[PDB]
Enzyme design. Sequence first.
Site, PDB file in Angstrom:
ATOM      1  N   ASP A  41       0.027   0.817 -20.215  1.00 37.20           N
ATOM      2  CA  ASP A  41      -0.973   1.630 -19.512  1.00 37.20           C
ATOM      3  C   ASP A  41      -0.341   2.829 -18.791  1.00 37.20           C
ATOM      4  O   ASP A  41      -0.816   3.233 -17.720  1.00 37.20           O
ATOM      5  CB  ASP A  41      -1.826   0.764 -18.564  1.00 37.20           C
ATOM      6  CG  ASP A  41      -3.257   1.302 -18.366  1.00 37.20           C
ATOM      7  OD1 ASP A  41      -3.714   2.193 -19.132  1.00 37.20           O
ATOM      8  OD2 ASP A  41      -3.935   0.869 -17.397  1.00 37.20           O
ATOM      9  N   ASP A  55      -0.785  -1.239 -11.469  1.00 38.67           N
ATOM     10  CA  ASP A  55      -1.749  -1.655 -12.501  1.00 38.67           C
ATOM     11  C   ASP A  55      -1.043  -2.241 -13.720  1.00 38.67           C
ATOM     12  O   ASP A  55      -0.663  -1.525 -14.670  1.00 38.67           O
ATOM     13  CB  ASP A  55      -2.748  -0.553 -12.905  1.00 38.67           C
ATOM     14  CG  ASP A  55      -3.972  -1.138 -13.631  1.00 38.67           C
ATOM     15  OD1 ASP A  55      -3.890  -2.320 -14.098  1.00 38.67           O
ATOM     16  OD2 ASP A  55      -4.997  -0.426 -13.744  1.00 38.67           O
ATOM     17  N   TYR A  60       0.851  -1.204   0.000  1.00 38.56           N
ATOM     18  CA  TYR A  60       0.000   0.000   0.000  1.00 38.56           C
ATOM     19  C   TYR A  60       0.886   1.253   0.000  1.00 38.56           C
ATOM     20  O   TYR A  60       1.692   1.429   0.912  1.00 38.56           O
ATOM     21  CB  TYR A  60      -0.975   0.033   1.198  1.00 38.56           C
ATOM     22  CG  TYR A  60      -1.746   1.345   1.306  1.00 38.56           C
ATOM     23  CD1 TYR A  60      -2.506   1.789   0.245  1.00 38.56           C
ATOM     24  CD2 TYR A  60      -1.752   2.097   2.488  1.00 38.56           C
ATOM     25  CE1 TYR A  60      -3.243   3.002   0.303  1.00 38.56           C
ATOM     26  CE2 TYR A  60      -2.439   3.315   2.552  1.00 38.56           C
ATOM     27  CZ  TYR A  60      -3.181   3.756   1.475  1.00 38.56           C
ATOM     28  OH  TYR A  60      -3.933   4.936   1.513  1.00 38.56           O
ATOM     29  N   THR A  68      -5.681   3.557 -22.654  1.00 40.47           N
ATOM     30  CA  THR A  68      -6.528   4.738 -22.488  1.00 40.47           C
ATOM     31  C   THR A  68      -6.390   5.660 -23.705  1.00 40.47           C
ATOM     32  O   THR A  68      -5.247   5.978 -24.099  1.00 40.47           O
ATOM     33  CB  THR A  68      -6.107   5.462 -21.223  1.00 40.47           C
ATOM     34  OG1 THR A  68      -6.255   4.562 -20.082  1.00 40.47           O
ATOM     35  CG2 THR A  68      -6.936   6.740 -21.005  1.00 40.47           C
ATOM     36  N   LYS A 117      -0.016   6.375 -17.584  1.00 39.55           N
ATOM     37  CA  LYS A 117      -0.847   7.569 -17.405  1.00 39.55           C
ATOM     38  C   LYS A 117      -0.728   7.988 -15.940  1.00 39.55           C
ATOM     39  O   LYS A 117      -0.325   7.177 -15.096  1.00 39.55           O
ATOM     40  CB  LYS A 117      -2.312   7.274 -17.753  1.00 39.55           C
ATOM     41  CG  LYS A 117      -2.982   6.102 -16.953  1.00 39.55           C
ATOM     42  CD  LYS A 117      -4.391   5.882 -17.420  1.00 39.55           C
ATOM     43  CE  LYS A 117      -4.926   4.648 -16.791  1.00 39.55           C
ATOM     44  NZ  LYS A 117      -6.391   4.505 -17.094  1.00 39.55           N
ATOM     45  N   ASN A 155      -1.861   5.878 -12.808  1.00 39.24           N
ATOM     46  CA  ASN A 155      -1.170   4.625 -12.506  1.00 39.24           C
ATOM     47  C   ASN A 155       0.188   4.818 -11.847  1.00 39.24           C
ATOM     48  O   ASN A 155       0.922   3.819 -11.662  1.00 39.24           O
ATOM     49  CB  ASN A 155      -1.029   3.729 -13.752  1.00 39.24           C
ATOM     50  CG  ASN A 155      -2.336   3.054 -14.131  1.00 39.24           C
ATOM     51  OD1 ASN A 155      -3.255   2.997 -13.315  1.00 39.24           O
ATOM     52  ND2 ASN A 155      -2.394   2.491 -15.315  1.00 39.24           N
TER      53      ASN A 155
END
Length: 340
Positions: A156, A174, A112, A191, A158, A161
């Site tokens: 991915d 991700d 986390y 995306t 962006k 992320n």
Amino acid sequence: EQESVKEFLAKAKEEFLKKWESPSQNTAQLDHFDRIKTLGTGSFGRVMLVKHKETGNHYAMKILDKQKVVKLKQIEHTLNEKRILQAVNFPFLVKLEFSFKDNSNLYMVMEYVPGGEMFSHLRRIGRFSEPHARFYAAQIVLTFEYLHSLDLIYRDLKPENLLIDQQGYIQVTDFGFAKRVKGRTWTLCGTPEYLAPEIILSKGYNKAVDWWALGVLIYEMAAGYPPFFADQPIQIYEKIVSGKVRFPSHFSSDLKDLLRNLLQVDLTKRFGNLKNGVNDIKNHKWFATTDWIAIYQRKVEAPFIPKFKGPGDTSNFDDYEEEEIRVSINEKCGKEFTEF
Ligand SMILES: O[C@@H]1CCN(Cc2nc(C3(O)CCNCC3)cs2)C1
């Protein structure tokens, strides 16, 4: 390159392949954790803050609904994500600690990172100065050097992320579109604002799509908005395939020159995809002040440290409706997910 970089990458590949060929499985279960809060939600899954009951450690648990994964044609993608994450190791990648499945769901339990998504900080501050954008961009350049040397494409990149950690450094999260690719690949995914022209045009494509997306990310960090945008995806795609890009006058001449070479519509002329590989980017004038070894070793003072109170603080993430984690009495989709 220097032999020390070559030897680093050769060992990185050896260690990746050993875990790739013998993946870990079934290393925890749901009732080992207490649920705290939903941190994000999508078409087939969500991410929840959890606490391990015996150790007290916090984790980000990604929960994927097997039936929705099947309906949305994500089976192979979710198998890629878990197999890659259990095999990689790099300072700027979020670490997978456990994975498991049950009658209804797949679970990936990640460390986390409490500082929030780069996207929130970017939109609150407006834009990052060039030194601040360059500190983050350097971490992405090193992470792609690592991933591409293992024959992995990320697909991915962006701001949502990229999480900011307790030292102000990036953690990439991700891996839902990441894949091991030795030549080309063909799936339409990602995306809209970040897609390279060759994805939009349904061509076989390669790692050059990640270097295009780095050009979009650096433009968005330094301007505050991405270079290609529109109300509808089809209008974004027309802009991308023209590649017509206007730069703000406050951009330095070095930044404009780097971006014209990353946002190159012809993939055979794009920086990162030429004979010298990543070194055309690392040796570009916009990076002249960057100490690549110091960044890798986490010895550079970060541009800012997120404000948070402790390892379980959720104040830098947003609020979502809190829904059950239901587990069916009957097994769903067992065949499709045997290897997970
Ligand atoms: O209808 C046929 C029977 C099984 N079906 C599998 C499918 N595979 C996809 C993939 O997109 C293809 C590229 N690799 C990622 C998954 C979409 S449907 C195809």
